[PDB]
């Protein structure tokens, strides 16, 4: 029940009954689908740069509280995250932070240390069982010289300039035994949180020193084989301030670790390494992209000089004494946190002050929480502020440059309801990149539902902004890669009342259609056939009684809007892009995404052919088209027909270092109007004649 | 516990700490003393619960212990002419001996300890404190004691026979399931005892034979109280060590409903007969 | 009689005898007949926009006083509503309102609050039973 697996002795060990534990889910190798959205959000942990992620790992990369609609991190993009996770799109995550986020949480360990005469107690036998007037016997020796300790665990204070002293603490004057000044506080170790969030303030740790009789019984033979006392270490985390902690297990499904002080504690019989920091940080983390988990704690630090000094002091004092080893190497055997050896014989001449005396009892039931930390100001307002801060500075951001095609394969951006000031920074994505696609919304989810006139004004304002980024700046072709969707409603997949725009519904449709990991459109999910042309995750849509003039004006301004299918549901009469000309090639908004993908295939061709010494012109020209056609054919489900042509023109002959490609494509449109008429006949001349 | 004094009662709970296939029944009565009152019952129950709380089922994760039960009450033995006081643990002991003691290791469906005539007291009479108040009964139930009530003017019955598991889990709420789990723990020992220390085995054969043994031994034995499944393997730590393998059993059970309502509506005879 | 269901303690609770209560009727999925009439009326409650309704639910969507011929809501269309309900036609209801209907009813709760000195009363024991000079004690 207590014994651990010391060695090979024949034995069956019983781990008690337990309740089921969450199992971390393995991931799969990533791929490029035809629909690759970028989603920005507030989160609990995880990296703070764009990351290509497989939905299986979102929960254990960014913490499972970021997707909870009733949590503190909910914003107008959490529904989008949840829909993407449900559908199974590998997508690009970007975790934002508020401008006022505090620093990480910390906890430093120290000891109040002094020397003085203390009392001595009885002993039954060589086992030294008696202490603290056990039985009925008064302490025996009048006064024995010894050492008094009082442990301390407290927040690591920062410098006057606002810089933490994580690595740079120093000793100070103590308070116990101030009758003699040499009473001093000396530090022993530091611990710090890995992320900037309340997870640090809710994380806790335990350290203790077990003996033969503990619940996890220790073994003297291993300590003899490698001379160092072994302490148990544990990490716990709670849900909120009022909940109770739960153990955070190592990557091998263990509840706690054994660690020790020393340079390198290698076990010849089993080659196990018992070093404190190395063992902790190797056993509690896993960076492999498929099995990914990072511990809440960062890498611990130890004050080797001070710990060694205190160990040497106690050895010098009481190592040459009755019931402890005096050898030179027992220094690291000395039990510091406890007051007894592994066998459980108390150290006389060493006194540790209890709780009532201002000390901290390091046992297996005490718990310690890191101090400080926090998330910052959360909500839609701060979310819009952060998103604007990212989007406005795209060409000179020092965090990431998103014109990097190879490193940021995102190709879509959906407007989830940003404010009208942030809305106008989105269109420039299709001006900065040639394989990008955007969906815009005319509703600011933080405000009231717009009326007909307000929707018209916002639509005109967005079209004016879009008109500044023509497709071909050389020839002024109007933009066609995207669409604008008007409307708003309420989310149906939740009991709470949560307004959302219809871009969420179209986002789900596209996730299901063009989200397959193999880069081929699924014919069963055609966004404009069967049941995929109806609204499915929004209810109580507004302005459903539009007049004919209003509907005609919206159509002629190129919005996408819904109508009533029956008394219960709505549908899209036609899903057109915001291309402004009369060409019928570029109307269906899906063709825009198809064209973006073609642009991507061209970049791949260049990437694969650039900078080769022994190629010839004909081989280069041939290989380019081979690559494009091979990558493109059979993917677009008959929405396009395309043909590439590479060559070396006169300008290429002049330059001597370039070749040219040109892709010709064609597509169709749809019909939307119907006539109806009737004529009345007699039954005889209608049935015959 | 057949009526040991309270000093000896407090050294028994350590059996479910020292062994992983043990099941204990405790009594809140000292047969050498006077029949206890309600307050003394409550005090002894709290003391025994405090003692039991020191031996969690899982020391690693602190699962509260669930192998056993506590039974309160006392009476007089009916199978003798003399006057011989006894606690109700005797009656439950007889019931369990009849139910789960067959020499062939399969539970008898005809003696279920909570169906038919086995859910009544049969070898004790003149039980005490049968006029408990509603508050007293509620307190005992919430403290996880097993107590009897009046069936009719002549006899008593057990409204519900639960274990001293203190959590909200409904899997571990019946006392018999604890005995079933103890038997599972025994089967695992048998598997090890059979497979240990063999030169010519392979890892796959070891893993397969462990599960085979546990499943073959357990299937068809528990009269449909449990459903369990074993899984043996060699984890990464086992790879590192080189002389160990792991087994893990998954099991499930049910519970029982205990509260009923009553309501009535008065109709005229015609509209009740047709309408 | 009194105590309510607090937990799982084995027990039987008696809710006394009662006189029957009206049971709300469950409705069925809507469909389109070949005859789909629109009917206007004054109603006790319910929405004030045209609504497609299954006749089983008229009484508990618009209150059961609207179909009463002797009530205050009787106009020259109540017979039409009653015939539709009797036949069983899903139809489109429109509840009109008079041009001078007042607003809704309201009730606010408040406390008159002050601090001062007051009297104190006897106590039998720690139970603090006595109040208002019960028994014979000032």
C-alpha to C-alpha distance for A598 and A642, rounded to whole angstroms = 9
Q: Which tokens go with A430? A: 């299709």
Question: A174, A359 in Cβ contact below 8 A?
Answer: no
Q: With CA atoms as reference, report the closest residue to C39 among C100, C85, C106, C107.
A: C85
Specify whether the CB–CB gap between C43 and B176 falls below 8 A. Answer: no
Distance of CA A347 to the CA centre of its chain: 48
Distances (CA, A) of C89 to C38, C52, C92: 11, 11, 10
Residue A502 near residue A516 (C-beta atoms within 8 A): no
Token digits for A172? Answer: 């100070």
Query: Best interface-test mutation with A: which of B13, B15, B20 has the largest number of A CBs within 10 A?
Result: B20
CA distance linking residue B153 with residue B169, whole number of Å: 36
**In contact, A274 and A267? CB cutoff 8 Å:** yes
Measure the CA–CA gap between A117 and A148, rounded to whole angstroms: 9
* Contacts of C74 by beta carbon, 8 Å cutoff, 6+ apart: C68
Contacts of A319 (CB under 8 A, 6+ apart): A325, A326, A327, A330, A331, A334
- Residue A405, classed as helix, strand or coil, is coil
The pair phi, psi for residue A60, each rounded to 5°, is -100, 5
Chain B CA closest to residue C17: B264
- Which of B127, B232, B157 is closest to B187 using CA atoms? B232
B neighbour chains, 3+ CB pairs within 8 Å? A, C
The verdict on a CB contact (< 8 Å) between C8 and B259 is: yes
C44 dihedral zone (left: phi>0; alpha: psi -120 to 50; beta): alpha
Could B265 and C18 be called an inter-chain contact, meaning their C-beta atoms sit closer than 8 Å?
yes
3 state DSSP class of B73: coil
Cα(B200)–Cα(B202) distance, integer angstroms: 7
**Chain C: residues touching B (Cβ < 8 Å):** 3, 5-21
E strand map for A47-86: 51-53
Give the residue from chain A lying closest to B189, CA to CA: A12
Gap between the Cα atoms of A428 and B24, Å rounded: 75
Could you give the C-alpha distances from A136 to A139, A545, A643, B65, in angstroms and in order? 10, 92, 100, 35
CB contact (8 A) between residue A8 and residue B197: no
Torsions phi, psi for A115 (to 5 deg): -120, 145
Query: Which among B142, B159, B262 has CB closest to C14?
Result: B262
Paired sense of beta strands A563-564 and A570-571, if any? antiparallel
> Under a CB-based contact definition with an 8 Å cutoff, are residues A225 and A217 in contact?
no
SS3 of residue C112 by DSSP? coil
Question: How far apart are the C-alpha atoms of A375 and A197, rounded to whole Å?
Answer: 5
CA end-to-end span of chain B: 60
- Tokens, residue A255: 């509840």
Both tokens of A584, joined, read 């019928």
| Closest C-chain CA to B265 | C18
Nearest by CB to residue C18, choosing from B149, B261, B263, is: B263
Cα–Cα nearest to B27, from B65, B66, B75, B64: B75
Evaluate the CA torsion angle C49, C54, C57, C58 in order and state its sign.
Answer: positive
Length of chain A: 689
Per-residue HEC secondary structure of C46-111 comes to CCCCCEEECHHHHHHHCCCCCCCCCCCCCCCCHHHHHHHHHHCCCEEEEEECCCCCCCCCCCCCCC
Contact C11 B258 (CB under 8 A): yes
How many helices (H) does chain A have, and how many strands (E)?
A: 16, 24
Identify residues after which chain C is interrupted (C–N over 2.5 A): none
φ and ψ of B259, to 5 deg? -125, 140
Contacts of B159 in chain C (CB under 8 A): 10
Q: Return the DSSP state at A539.
A: E
**Per-position DSSP letters for A421-463, written without gaps between them:** HHHTTSTTHHHH-SS-EEEEES--TTSPPP-HHHHHHHHHHHH
| Integer angstrom CA distances of residue A194 from A58, A105, A252 | 18, 9, 21
- Tell me the C-alpha distance between C19 and B265, whole Å: 5
CA-CA distance, A194 to A284, in Å (whole number)? Answer: 13
Contact B63 A17 (CB under 8 A): yes
Angle, vertex CA A515, rays to CA A510 and CA A518, nearest 5: 150
Return the SS3 of A223: helix
What tokens appear for C58 in the block?
């008229």
Chain C partners of A568 at a C-beta cutoff of 8 Å? 30
CA distance A500 to A508: 13
Task: Provide the token pair at A529.
Answer: 């056939």
8 A C-beta contact, residue A371 and residue A105: yes
Question: By a Cβ cutoff of 8 Å, what residues of chain C touch chain A?
Answer: 30, 52
How far out from the chain centre does Cα A209 lie? Answer: 35
Conformation bin of residue A162: beta by default, left when phi > 0, alpha when psi is -120 to 50:
left
C52 CB neighbours in chain A (<8 A) are: 567
Residues in chain B: 275
Are the CB atoms for B245 and B191 separated by under 8 Å?
A: no
Classify residue C25 by its DSSP letter. Answer: P
Handedness of CA A43, A44, A48, A52 (dihedral sign): negative
Pick the closest to residue B26 from B70, B65, B60, B57 (CA basis).
Answer: B70
Query: Which residues, 6 or more positions from C13, have their beta carbon under 8 angstroms from its beta carbon?
Result: B259, B260, B261, B262, C3, C4, C5
Which of A228, A504, A469, A182 has the alpha carbon at shortest distance from A342?
A: A228
| A134-to-A131, A138, C77 alpha-carbon distances in Å | 5, 8, 97
| DSSP element (H, E) containing B94 | helix B89-99
DSSP string spanning B152-221? SSS-EE-S--B-S--SS-STT-BHHHHHHHHHHHHHHHHHHHHHTT-SS--HHHHHHHHHHHHHHHHTT-
CB within 8 Å of A124: residues ≥ 6 apart: A130
Beta bridge partners of B162: B174
Burial of B245 (0-12, 13-18, 19+ CB in 10 A): middle
d(CA A199, CA A105): 9
Nearest residue in chain A measured CA to CA from C31:
A567
Whether B259 and C12 lie within 8 Å, measured CB to CB: yes
Instruction: Give A568 to chain C, closest Cα distance, Å.
Output: 10
- The neighbouring-strand residues paired with A643 are A664
Helices A548-556 and A452-466: angle between axes, nearest 10 degrees: 10
CB contact at 8 A, A431 and A474:
no
Q: What is the CA radius of gyration of chain A?
A: 35
* In contact, B96 and B113? CB cutoff 8 Å: yes
Contact of A10 with B196, CB cutoff 8 Å: yes
Residues contacting residue A135 through CB under 8 Å, at least 6 positions apart:
A122
**How distant, in Å, are the alpha carbons of B99, C52, C91 from that of C32?**
64, 10, 9
Please tell me what resolution, in angstroms, this structure has: 3.0
* B165–chain C nearest CA distance, Å: 15
Neighbours of chain A (3+ CB pairs under 8 A): B, C
8 Å CB contact between A310 and A113: yes
Is B59's CB within 8 Å of A2's CB?
A: yes
**Alpha-carbon gap, residue A329 to A10, rounded angstroms:** 33
Nearest Cα to Cα of residue C78 among C69, C91, C70: C69
Interface of A with B (CB under 8 A): 1-2, 5, 8, 10, 12, 14-19, 215-216, 247, 252-253, 255-256, 270
Count the Cβ atoms, other than its own, within 10 Å of residue B71.
24
A484 in helix, strand or coil? strand
Residue A161 has phi, psi (to 5 degrees) of: -85, -15
Radius of gyration in angstroms for the set of CA atoms belonging to chain B, rounded to a whole number: 23
Neighbours of B66 (CB within 10 A): 24
**Helical H segments across A519-616, by residue range:** 548-556, 589-609
Give yes or no for a contact between A256 and A216, defined as CB atoms under 8 angstroms apart.
yes
HEC secondary structure over B258-269: CEECCCEEECCH
Q: Given the structure tokens 């069936």, which residue do they identify? A: B151
**Which letter does DSSP use for residue A25 in this model?**
P
DSSP B234: -
- Token pair of C91 as six digits: 């139809």
- The residue in chain A having the minimum alpha-carbon distance to the alpha carbon of residue B171 is A19
* Pairing assessment for the beta strands B85-87 and B74-77 based on DSSP bridges: antiparallel
Residue-wise DSSP of A606-649: HHHHSS-SS--HHHHHHHHHHHHHHHHTTSSTTS-EEEEEEE--
């Amino acid at each position: 029940m207590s014994e651990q697996i010391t060695g090979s002795t024949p034995r069956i060990y019983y781990r008690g009954t337990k309740d089921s534990s969450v199992t971390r889910s393995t991931g799969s190798t990533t791929t490029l689908p035809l629909h690759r959205p970028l989603i920005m959000f507030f989160g609990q942990k995880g990296p703070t740069v764009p990351t290509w992620i497989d939905p299986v790992k979102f929960e254990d990369i960014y913490g499972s509280e970021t997707t909870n609609l009733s949590g503190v991190y909910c914003t107008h993009s959490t529904p989008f995250i949840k829909e993407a996770i449900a559908a199974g799109n590998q997508f690009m995550a970007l975790r934002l932070e508020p401008s006022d986020i505090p620093d990480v949480a910390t906890l430093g360990l120290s000891v109040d240390w002094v020397k003085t005469k203390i009392d001595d107690y009885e002993r039954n036998d060589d086992g030294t069982y008696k202490l603290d007037t056990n039985g009925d016997k008064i302490p025996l020796a009048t006064q024995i010289d010894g050492i008094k300790f009082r442990f301390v665990l407290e927040k690591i204070e920062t410098n006057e300039s606002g810089v933490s002293q994580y690595k740079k603490r120093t000793a100070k004057a103590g308070t116990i035994g101030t009758e003699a000044t040499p009473s001093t506080i000396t530090p022993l170790a530091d611990f710090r949180c890995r992320f900037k969030s309340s997870l640090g303030a809710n994380t806790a740790l335990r350290i203790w020193a077990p003996t033969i009789n503990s619940a996890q019984a220790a073994d003297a033979d291993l300590q003899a084989r490698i001379k160092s006392f072994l302490y148990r270490f544990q990490i716990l985390t709670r849900a909120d301030k009022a909940s109770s902690p739960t153990i955070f297990e190592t990557i091998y499904n263990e509840p706690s670790l054994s660690v020790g002080f020393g340079e390198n504690l290698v076990d010849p019989q089993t080659e196990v390494v018992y070093d404190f920091v190395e063992r902790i940080d190797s056993r509690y983390n896993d960076e492999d992209p498929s099995t990914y988990l990072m511990s809440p704690l960062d890498t611990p630090y130890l004050y080797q000089a001070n710990i060694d000094s205190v160990l040497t002091a106690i050895q010098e004092l009481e190592a040459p004494f009755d019931t402890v080893s005096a050898d030179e190497d027992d220094l690291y055997q000395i039990n510091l946190f406890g007051a007894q050896t592994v066998e459980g014989v108390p150290y006389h001449a060493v006194q540790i002050l209890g709780v009532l005396d201002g000390g901290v009892t390091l046992t297996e039931t005490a718990t310690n929480y890191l101090q400080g930390g926090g998330d910052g100001t959360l909500g839609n307002d701060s979310f819009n502020a952060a998103a604007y801060a990212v989007l406005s500075n795209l060409s000179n951001n020092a965090a990431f440059n998103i014109t990097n095609y190879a490193r940021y394969p995102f190709n879509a951006f959906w407007d989830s309801g940003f404010d009208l000031k942030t809305k106008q920074t989105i269109p420039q994505l299709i001006g900065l990149r040639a394989d990008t696609w955007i969906a815009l919304s005319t509703q600011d989810i933080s405000s009231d539902f717009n009326s007909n006139e307000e929707e018209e004004s916002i639509a005109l304002s967005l079209m004016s902004r879009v008109s500044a980024f023509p497709d071909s700046s050389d020839f002024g072709t109007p933009a066609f890669r995207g669409m604008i969707v008007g409307g708003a409603g309420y989310y149906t997949e939740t009991t709470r009342k949560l307004p959302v725009p219809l871009t969420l519904d179209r986002f789900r449709a596209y996730c299901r259609y063009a989200g397959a990991s193999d880069g081929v459109l699924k014919p069963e999910y055609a966004v404009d056939e069967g049941d995929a042309r109806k609204v499915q995750v929004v209810k109580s849509i507004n302005n459903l009684d539009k007049s004919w003039r209003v509907r005609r004006a919206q159509w002629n301004n190129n919005l996408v809007y819904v109508e009533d299918y029956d008394t219960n549901s709505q549908f899209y009469p036609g899903q057109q892009s915001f291309y402004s000309e009369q060409g019928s090639v570029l109307k269906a908004a899906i063709v825009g995404l198809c064209v973006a993908n073609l642009n991507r295939f061209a970049f791949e061709a260049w990437r694969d052919l650039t900078g080769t010494q022994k190629l010839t012109d004909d081989q280069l020209i041939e290989r380019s088209d081979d690559a494009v056609s091979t990558r493109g054919t059979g993917a677009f489900d008959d929405r396009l027909i395309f043909t590439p042509h590479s060559e070396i023109t006169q300008a290429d002959k002049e330059r001597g270092y370039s070749w040219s490609m040109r892709i010709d494509f064609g597509a169709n449109a749809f019909r939307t109007v119907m006539d109806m008429s009737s004529v009345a006949y007699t039954r005889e001349e209608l049935a015959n004649g």
